[PDB]
Design a protein around this ligand. Structure first.
Ligand SMILES: Nc1ncnc2c1ncn2[C@@H]1O[C@H](CSCC[C@H](N)C(=O)O)[C@@H](O)[C@H]1O
Ligand code: NA
Lengths: 265, 265
């Protein structure tokens, strides 16, 4: 009578950990959600085939409003697994679901999986140098989100890198590209005029981490804003002051302009 | 002609991903390092048995000084794997190993795995709220480093959480315990008297992340400094002001005192 939160990883069904797979194969019921992120390299069918179980996919409403009515009941008498893209607790509100499990007298366990939060290391940017993170959300009607602007500002001032999660509207199959993120951000800069994010700002784009050939690009906004980085998901990063070896990596591996090698210490 | 950087994950031999295992099994040569960290929940023998390949262990010097003459030559005519605890490229000097590969006309691919950077999400603390990260090191001779103290200060000051890695002596398999870290920091607070780390400071301890039964504890230093957190590795976190949901998780899941619901929110 336990509930397992099992992450599926970054790109395809093989990004699940061996631990996660062996446990998932032995659960009586398997649920999952695919709205918190996009696993561009697999399909529900492939996942099901891999674990050898039928997977009942849940919507944001099913989870957020009815988790304790749909999932928890079965966990009281069976072994249940709840699958999610990446790591189940990273940049989601899934952690709170563990509190619901407890209140319903259901023991829960967490099986991690590779997350975009650590995969940023493939950009060559020292991970310990990342500051507060943020999300670039799509404007809705008259509401235009801007919180991410001050986060970048705050981190840049301290010389820290900023990781920017990009928006996703799964039910509409909408996945924000780095290009769309940059356009929205330039519009905010136009309004705030803080010099935080401009055409001369160096940025890094990581697309489809987890795949064997992810797209890793670094350069100035003016040059990258219209570049094609391939299919989603995309993640955007605004570096802070660079170490010599970070700049070297960005140039040698991410195709950045050789001029970023010259750091302004 | 190919070099694979493969992450081993968090704690035991099952923490590698299905993708990492299958690729490792097809490699002609397999190297690994355990100087950046150890896999406390398993052994070299178990990892070797699971992968079914002899694993050549490399020291810090083998990697930093001679990676290109030990690993890369073999990668020119074979498929070589380089295993590391956690997620590849998280250790700050590992990213530059890919530059070395390029220079040697060797292709390299990264296979991700769970990292403590993302696994800490199991503490219920929102990942976007983490700021700069640091490592707590032991004073030595006339050297008394305290940089991590300023990091905690700069983060908390902005409402951000601080992830603290504890000093480790891989070769000797000597880990700094959370208890030792706290004592060291109270000592640092006594010298800088900045009111950053005191008996009243709230902290979180994560031990054996990755195992099915990790130790997750939260509370004030005065009560946790002498508490037994079990076998290493221990990870320490000094949270910034908490979101009521984070605090509730720490109370319900990590045994934190009710008091945090009004004092640290
Ligand atoms: N493989 C990938 N490549 C690039 N960005 C990714 C990604 N996976 C997730 N993201 C980014 O993160 C957003 C989802 S946020 C949820 C993250 C997830 N729990 C994890 O552990 O990774 C996406 O909209 C995208 O901006
Ligand atoms: Na971080």
């Amino acid at each position: 009578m336990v509930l397992y939160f099992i992450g599926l990883g970054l790109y395809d069904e093989r990004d699940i950990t061996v631990k996660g797979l062996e446990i998932a194969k032995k659960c009586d019921y398997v649920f999952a959600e695919f709205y918190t992120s996009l696993m561009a390299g697999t399909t529900l069918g492939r996942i099901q085939k891999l674990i050898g179980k039928e997977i009942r996919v849940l919507s944001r409403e099913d989870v957020e409003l009815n988790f304790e009515n749909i999932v928890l009941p079965l966990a009281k008498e069976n072994d249940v697994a709840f699958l999610t893209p990446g790591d189940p607790l990273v940049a989601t509100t899934h952690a709170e679901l563990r509190i619901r499990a407890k209140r319903a007298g259901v023991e829960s366990y967490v099986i991690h999986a590779p997350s975009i939060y650590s995969a940023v290391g493939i950009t060559g940017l020292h991970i310990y140098k990342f500051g507060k993170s943020a999300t670039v959300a799509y404007p809705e009607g008259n509401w235009f989100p801007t919180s991410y602007y001050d986060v970048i500002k705050e981190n840049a001032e301290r010389g820290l890198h900023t990781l920017l999660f990009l928006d996703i509207k799964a039910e509409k199959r909408m996945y924000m590209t780095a290009n769309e993120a940059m356009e929205l951000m330039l519009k905010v800069e136009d309004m705030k005029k803080g010099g935080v994010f401009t055409d001369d700002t160096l940025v890094v784009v990581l697309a489809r981490a987890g795949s064997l050939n992810p797209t890793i690009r670094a350069g100035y906004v003016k040059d990258l804003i219209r570049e094609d980085f391939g299919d989603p998901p995309h993640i955007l990063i605004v570096p802070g002051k660079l170490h010599i070896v970070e700049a070297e990596y960005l140039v040698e591996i991410a195709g950045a302009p050789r001029e970023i090698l010259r750091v302004n210490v």
